A paper describes a structure:
X-ray crystallography shows that the N-terminal halves of their SNARE motifs bind the CALMANTH domain as helices in a manner that mimics SNARE complex formation. In this study, we provide structural, biochemical and in vivo data to show that the internalization of VAMP8, and consequently that of the highly related small R-SNAREs, VAMP3 and VAMP2, is mediated by specific, direct interactions between the N-terminal halves of their SNARE motifs and the ANTH (AP180 N-terminal Homology) domain of the endocytic clathrin adaptor CALM. Thus, CALM:R-SNARE interactions ensure that R-SNAREs, required for the fusion of endocytic clathrin-coated vesicles with endosomes and also for subsequent postendosomal trafficking, are sorted into endocytic vesicles.
In an attempt to obtain a structure of a complex between CALMANTH and VAMP8, a construct was designed in which residues 11–41 of VAMP8 were fused through an artificial linker of six residues to residues 1–264 of CALMANTH. The VAMP8 helix fitted into the spatially complementary groove of CALMANTH, lined by residues from helix 9 and helix 10, which was blocked by helix 11 in the unliganded CALMANTH structures and by dimerization in CALMANTH(1-264). There was a small movement of helices 9 and 10 with respect to each other that caused a slight widening of the groove as compared with the unliganded domain structure. No electron density was visible for 17 residues that connect the last ordered residue of CALM with the first of VAMP8. The interface is mainly hydrophobic in nature, burying a total of 1500Å2 of accessible surface area, and a full list of interacting residues is given in Figure 5D. The residues Lys24 and Met27 of VAMP8 play key roles in the interaction, explaining their initial identification as residues of importance for VAMP endocytosis (Grote et al., 1995) (Lewis et al., 2000).
Author numbering: 5 to 258, 1015 to 1038
Amino acid sequence: SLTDRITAAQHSVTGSAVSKTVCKATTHEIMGPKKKHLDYLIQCTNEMNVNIPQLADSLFERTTNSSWVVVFKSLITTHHLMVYGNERFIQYLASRNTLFNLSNFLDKSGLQGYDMSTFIRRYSRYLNEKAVSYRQVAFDFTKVKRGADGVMRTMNTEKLLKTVPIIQNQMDALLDFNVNSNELTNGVINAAFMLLFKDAIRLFAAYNEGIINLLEKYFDMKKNQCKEGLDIYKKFLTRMTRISEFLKVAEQVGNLQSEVEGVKNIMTQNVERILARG
């Protein structure tokens, strides 16, 4: 039967089809991964007959390429699957103990490759942290129910104190991408930035809701919990200027206006409440 399952697998073309599509999503063409290939891979993540770790292996493999174009596109494809694919994909990445290792990545083929290597390294760290965040709390901050009956707003004190700093780590990694509007000049980096922006808006909301919950609980916590809360407030306050810059860039490059306005509004409201306590 194990022998049967193996022989069956040696006659299956599923894995090979998946790998070929990963290659098509990550060609040397300087454009975002094509929608048709991303869609096919999304459907793959819905298929129980698809080997998810093998699909992930193919994406990691493409990140060993020397070309920034191939590497960046593999990161983008991975991100796209984490966001739009079956949740078992990000769940699987969260379960791995080795993720992307692109901290030394440097393509020297020309100025474009050189400039893009910096963003590849930052983006890779963000995707690693996105997986790690899921691993640490066992859910995706950008997917959970929001509002007063939502996850972040209803979380109990002890969990809340452990959870907000994880949101803060994922946020920091996202904010470290740090691209200027005049650097968004090719389809590859633009595709990555669109996904980052989508994550960011949802992440900012989760962060704000965590802060709101803390503010509501503040007068009812133990003393050591208050200390941790204060540490959370202080870190919230110090990232405001970096968050403001992020939203500014997103607007320069063009709900967009609205979703950003609500982030500015709730964040401003939170700042005011925090400063009023101090």
